[PDB]
């Protein structure tokens, strides 16, 4: 599994950083990191893919990178809407999914 | 613009076995860009990875939950769906289905739960 | 002369545009030769473009065209009626073929798809009582996927199979994304027998079938030839052909 | 010269599910010309069919009773079987199998109940 | 489902006509009219077959038509042996199977 | 790890499926299997499918 922060904090207006920590095996060797943002009663939300990429329809204040093995889901503009959990998901030598914790998100 | 729908018991009784299906509409099940995934997230926990159904392939399972899990297809009715033996206290979580993509449309290999059904909360107990 | 003549008082058969596989299976581009009186030759244009209209290919048609070389005339005779098909749905086609914008087909093929929620196995068989060898060309779809298999045909694995007293064919679809050509990433495979006098041909499907619904008698078997030209028909007459004019000599060579 | 021959539970109760099967003897179960149809016929009613076996296409089943049924087959045995989930006391009727003929003999296409078993009855109850 | 009478009855040796009527998709349509003949406690025999024509073994005293959307079965010289229930079955422009209410056939 | 398995390439004019076949064969160069090679050719402009 992948190490998330339990949780994260900010007020509205601000830039937050969810950080996601692997290994060389999950992380650092691919660039196939994913982060989905789940609202409570709600199935995730496919927010970032590929690492950068964003999905049609997602908004680009969500926006990502990576460096060794971290990964770091960024959200400009924290908006009352955005509290959510947030969760890193990325390819591995093993060729199944992993998974990470999960950040808890809270607009203050 | 595919639909994915989970229908199931909300209960199980410990040591049973827990059957849930996933109906897929507005899109195949079938494809090559594809695997079908069952995710849970037993209540107060992030999200664990169940396993895949391979249509073209074979099926692949998280290795703790391998033992006790048969993923399958009905072709007929458009469905995929979950088994889990000898089910247990630990096994209560909300099982949902996804559509995962592990080659893109850019001619390249790629890797994200794109669809998800709005998922079907299964209790465990005795 | 610089002109293409008749050949021995008899006119060639000028396909235009079209070619022989766009002639036989009834391109609705080619209406203008569904009904095709005897020919002295075969002017056939180098590189036609009303061929297969729904993209595909024809097995041993280099073949088929030799063999159309010593044939001259020859009868168009329905064999399978496309009404016998009940239980079927015959109304297929594809905007690759369209008429006038409408989706359309190869004349003289059936596109056998789902009537309902069904494809019985689509069953038929013809004896050859014509008077003569006939040719007969028949095909098998080719879908761009399995959510198109199942949309033109209930059965996914399917077949499709043919046979005589010495033809003994069975194929099966081959379901593969492929490049777009005329618009469809579908292919449709095509062949053809001749079926000898007296002999009985049998057809049997599950599924991606296109059935003749007419077979070719052939009525001459005459020394004959396809020449390769963009010329037209001159109204002339000759002994001696080129692609260039019709000679006219009494010489021992010519160049 | 077929014979057809049903057999099964003559009870089964209220909510489980029915499961009926017929010998085929005296002749096969695959064939190109042939579908093998389930019947039945309720006391007081008439002829209601319930579904069709193509051995070498897709089944498909009397759209009502249609979520509810399942048609197959056993050719170890030459058998085929029907199945009937969350039987009510409305499924209280005669089961029958048959020989369905589509196509004929003739080279033509054709459309008719050619061999019966004799049926068996099945009660529905509380 | 195709319409029926629900009984029909003569005399001995009279002849008697029982109908069949449908749509244009099932019985107009197609020439697929088939009749059987189901007494009590057996199951159904087939009589006739693509709307005019008799199994071999079937009595040449049942013969059959259609006009329009109408079907009819009819029985000759008929015999106290001829009580039963008649029924109709048609294809149709969904391809499954459709068959009639039935037809009780009382011999007076 | 899948074993029903086949080869599918194409192109405008290529169209062909293989599936491999499993034998016991004697060994060439020490082993019994066999490996099958095929060719095309790409015509400008066209585009070359593997799967
Ligand atoms: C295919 O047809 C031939 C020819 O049948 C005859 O000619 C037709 C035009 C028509 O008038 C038919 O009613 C005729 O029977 C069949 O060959 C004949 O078979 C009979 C019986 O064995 C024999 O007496 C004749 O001499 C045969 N005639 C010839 C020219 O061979 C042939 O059997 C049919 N094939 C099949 C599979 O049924
Ligand atoms: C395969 O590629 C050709 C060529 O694409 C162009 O040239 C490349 C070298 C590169 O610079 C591309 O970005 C160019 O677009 C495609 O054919 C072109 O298609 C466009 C759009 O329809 C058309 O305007 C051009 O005239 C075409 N050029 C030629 C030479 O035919 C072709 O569509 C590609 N095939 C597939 C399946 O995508
Ligand atoms: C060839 O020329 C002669 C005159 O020399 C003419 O009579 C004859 O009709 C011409 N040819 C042919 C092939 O008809």
């Known amino acids: 599994a992948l190490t998330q922060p339990a949780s994260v904090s900010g007020s509205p207006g601000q830039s937050i950083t969810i950080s996601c920590t692997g290994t060389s095996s999950d992380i650092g060797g691919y660039n196939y990191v994913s982060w989905y943002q789940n609202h409570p009663g709600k199935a995730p939300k496919l927010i970032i893919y590929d690492v950068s990429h964003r999905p049609s329809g997602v908004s680009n204040r969500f926006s990502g990178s990576k460096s060794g093995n971290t990964a770091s889901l960024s959200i400009s503009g924290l908006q009352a809407e955005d509290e959510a959990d947030y969760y890193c998901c990325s390819f591995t030598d093993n060729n199944i999914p992993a998974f990470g914790g999960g950040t808890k998100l809270t607009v203050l | 613009q595919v639909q994915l729908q989970e229908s199931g018991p909300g209960l199980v009784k410990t040591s049973e076995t827990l059957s849930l299906t996933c109906?897929?509409?507005?899109?195949?099940?079938?494809?090559?860009?594809?695997?079908?995934?069952?995710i849970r997230q037993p209540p107060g926990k992030g999200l664990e990875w169940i396993g895949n159904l391979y249509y073209s392939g074979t099926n692949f399972y998280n290795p703790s939950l391998e033992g006790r899990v048969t993923i399958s297809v009905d072709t007929s009715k458009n469905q995929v769906s979950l088994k889990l033996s000898s089910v247990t206290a630990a096994d209560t979580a909300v099982?949902?289905?996804?559509?995962?993509?592990?080659?893109?449309?850019?001619?390249?290999?790629?890797?994200?739960?794109?669809?998800?059904?709005?998922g079907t909360l299964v209790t465990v107990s005795s | 002369n610089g002109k293409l003549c008749k050949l021995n008082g008899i006119p060639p058969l000028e396909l235009g545009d079209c070619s022989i596989a766009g002639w036989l299976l009834g391109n609705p581009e080619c209406d203008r030769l569904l009904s095709v009186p005897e020919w002295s030759y075969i002017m056939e244009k180098e590189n036609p473009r009303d061929g297969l209209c729904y993209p595909g290919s024809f097995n041993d048609y280099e073949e088929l065209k030799h063999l159309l070389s010593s044939v001259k005339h020859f009868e168009k005779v329905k064999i399978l009626p496309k009404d016998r098909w009940t239980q079927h749905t015959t109304t297929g086609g594809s905007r690759a073929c369209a008429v006038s914008g409408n989706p359309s087909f190869f004349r003289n093929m059936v596109w056998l798809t789902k009537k309902g929620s069904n494809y019985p196995v689509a069953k038929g068989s013809y004896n050859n009582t014509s008077g003569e060898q006939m040719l007969i060309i028949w095909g098998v779809h080719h879908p761009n996927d399995e959510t198109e298999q199942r949309t033109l045909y209930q059965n996914v694995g399917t077949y499709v199979s043919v046979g005589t007293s010495t033809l003994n064919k069975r194929s099966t679809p081959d379901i593969a994304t492929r490049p777009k050509v005329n618009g469809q990433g579908g292919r449709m495979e095509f062949s053809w027998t001749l079926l000898d006098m007296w002999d009985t041909i049998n057809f049997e499907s599950t599924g991606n079938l296109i059935a003749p619904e007419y077979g070719f008698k052939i009525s001459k078997r005459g020394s004959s030839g396809i020449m390769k030209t963009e010329g037209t028909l001159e109204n002339c007459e000759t002994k001696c052909q080129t692609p260039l004019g019709a000679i006219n000599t009494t010489l021992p060579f010519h160049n | 010269q077929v014979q057809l021959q049903e057999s099964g539970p003559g009870l089964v109760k209220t909510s489980e599910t029915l499961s009926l099967t017929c010998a085929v003897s005296?002749?096969?179960?695959?064939?190109?010309?042939?579908?093998w149809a389930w019947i039945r016929q309720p006391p007081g009613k008439g002829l209601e069919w319930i579904g069709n076996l193509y051995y070498s296409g897709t089944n498909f089943y009397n759209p009502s009773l249609e979520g509810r049924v399942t048609i197959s087959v056993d050719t170890s045995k030459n058998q085929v079987s029907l199945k009937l989930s969350s039987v009510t006391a409305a499924d209280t009727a005669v089961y029958f199998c048959?020989?369905?003929?589509?196509?004929?003999?003739?080279?033509?296409?054709?459309?008719?109940?050619?061999?019966w078993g004799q049926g068996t009855l099945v009660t529905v109850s509380s | 489902a195709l319409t029926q009478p629900a009984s029909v009855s003569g005399s001995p040796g009279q002849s008697i006509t029982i109908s069949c009527t449908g749509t244009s998709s099932d019985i107009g349509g197609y020439n697929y009219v088939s009749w059987y003949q189901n007494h009590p406690g057996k199951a159904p025999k087939l009589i006739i077959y693509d709307v005019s024509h008799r199994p071999s073994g079937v009595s040449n005293r049942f013969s059959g038509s259609k006009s329009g959307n109408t079907a009819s079965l009819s029985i000759s010289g008929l015999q106290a042996e001829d009580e039963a229930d008649y029924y109709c079955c048609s294809f149709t422009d969904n391809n499954i199977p459709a068959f009639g209410g039935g037809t009780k056939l009382t011999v007076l | 790890q899948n074993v029903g398995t086949y080869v599918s390439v194409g192109t405008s004019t290529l169209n062909k499926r293989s599936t491999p076949d499993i034998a016991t064969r004697p060994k060439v160069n020490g082993q019994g299997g066999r490996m099958e090679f095929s060719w095309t050719l790409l015509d400008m402009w066209d585009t070359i499918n593997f799967e």
């Open positions: 048959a020989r369905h003929v589509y196509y004929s003999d003739t080279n033509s296409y054709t459309y008719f109940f050619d061999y």
């Open positions: 005296g002749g096969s179960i695959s064939g190109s010309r042939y579908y």
